[PDB]
């Protein structure tokens, strides 16, 4: 990496001295060293970059966002100085984009990546990095435009293939997405051994009927992405007990189960009240999990937060659930009514995390046609009874009755999770 211009070469001694202090670990002593090199040589790109790396390392030690916001600015100052080496320009701005995403300034990291692509229009990897910026902000349209430009120049790039296939699969182009995912994973290129692409390639093959989906599930299990071929969640805490079906006494939430089963009729009546007088509060499933049919949900708690407007439609149920922090505080689960109408088949899928167990309270259950499979066992609901299963295992639902099926979903923390974990885990 050529990082010194002509003027910095004349002061390589003072630069390497302060760089040693940063490498030795005296981050405080190195910051003040580069700070005075900048004060002494205000146009040195390396001394400005060295000040930025010290602020970066210092922000790690102090765990400060304000210090990291200072490094982000110093990384930009290296780009304003004159006669800056091209390799130093890429590293200074790429680190700014990376740290901007760390803080959540996703819109700012996009602008920084756009500048890099405008400065280096031939770097394929920089365009690929810009595509990831769009996928982190939710702009799959512009992400597809980028990875199309990459594949028109470098059509053998696996990184662009798996991301192009991920967008096509997100856009319900299931058949077209498979070749981009299978080839990108097999490219072996850096960044293609991600469990997300194994999960979506096997899911895409399952919907089209290709039995080789489980060969890709087992391969992801061998490389450490999946806990098993059945438990394919990706936001996981290692060590938790894993079994597809649980019993109430096994979970330890016996007080919650009894409150639900003792008072199931009031929960049902408040849900039917929303059905009859506020259909708008039931929103359709929006995760493309349906092959066919109508499936709506009326959410009361999400990510540990209570929807005040929703609890105005089911007040007694919200008051009942208020007594149990094991479900109201589950920031990786929800509490919702789930209505499913005849002719509905939900694709085999997996929940995002293993940190929650999912409870189903039977409210309005038709006598035939309804059944849910988790792993290799199929069970059915019963009115006034609670089913408990680990939705991180592959599960599948059919509804082929002559009337609607209404259940109550209550997510709880995994019982083996420590309270420190329940308070620290990022919400999902």
């Amino acid at each position: 990496p050529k990082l010194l211009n002509k003027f910095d070469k004349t002061i390589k001694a003072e630069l390497d001295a302060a760089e040693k202090l940063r490498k030795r670990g005296k981050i405080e002593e190195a910051v003040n060293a580069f700070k005075e090199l900048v004060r002494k040589y205000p146009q040195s790109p390396r001394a400005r970059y060295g000040k930025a790396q010290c602020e970066d390392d210092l922000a790690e030690k102090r765990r400060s966002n304000e210090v990291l916001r200072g490094a982000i600015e110093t990384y930009q100052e290296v780009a304003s100085l004159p006669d800056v080496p091209a390799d130093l320009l890429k590293l200074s701005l790429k680190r700014r984009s990376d740290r901007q995403q760390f803080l959540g300034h996703m819109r700012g990291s996009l602008l920084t990546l756009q500048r890099l692509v405008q400065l280096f229009p031939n770097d394929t990897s920089l365009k690929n990095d810009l595509g990831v910026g769009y996928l982190l902000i939710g702009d799959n349209d512009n992400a597809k435009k980028v990875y199309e430009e990459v594949l028109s120049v470098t059509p053998n790039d696996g990184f662009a293939k798996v991301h192009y296939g991920f967008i096509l699969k997100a856009q319900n182009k299931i058949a077209e997405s498979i070749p981009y995912l299978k080839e990108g994973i097999e490219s072996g290129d850096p960044g293609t051994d991600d469990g997300r692409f194994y999960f979506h390639l096997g899911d895409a093959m399952q919907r089209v009927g290709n039995k080789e989906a489980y060969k890709w599930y087992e391969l992801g299990h061998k490389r450490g992405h999946f806990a098993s071929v059945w438990q394919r969640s990706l936001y996981n805490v290692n060590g938790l007990k894993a079994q597809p079906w649980w019993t109430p006494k096994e979970t330890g939430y016996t007080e919650l189960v009894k409150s639900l089963e003792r008072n199931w009729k009031l929960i049902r009546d408040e849900g039917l009240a929303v059905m009859d007088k506020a259909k708008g509060l039931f929103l359709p499933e929006d995760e493309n999990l349906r092959e066919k049919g109508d499936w709506s949900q009326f959410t009361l708690w999400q990510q540990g937060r209570r929807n005040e407007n929703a609890c105005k439609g089911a007040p007694k149920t919200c008051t009942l659930l208020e007594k149990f922090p094991e479900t109201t505080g589950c920031r990786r689960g929800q509490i919702k009514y789930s209505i499913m109408h005849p002719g509905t088949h939900v694709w085999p899928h997996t929940g995002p995390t293993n940190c929650r167990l999912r409870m189903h309270l039977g409210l309005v259950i038709p006598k035939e046609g309804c059944k849910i499979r988790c792993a290799n066992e199929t069970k059915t609901w019963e009115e006034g009874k609670v089913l408990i299963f680990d939705d991180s295992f592959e599960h599948e639902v059919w509804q082929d009755a002559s009337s609607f099926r209404l259940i109550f979903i209550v997510d709880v923390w995994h019982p083996e999770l420590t309270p420190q974990q329940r308070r620290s885990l990022p919400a999902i």
Binding site: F102, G104, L135, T353
Partner: peptide, 17 residues
């Protein structure tokens, strides 16, 4: 958001340290 499934590139939000 990832609720019953996992159809998003990232299911969490970054907020720094």
């Amino acid at each position: 958001k990832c609720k019953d499934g996992l159809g998003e590139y990232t299911c969490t939000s970054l907020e720094g340290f």
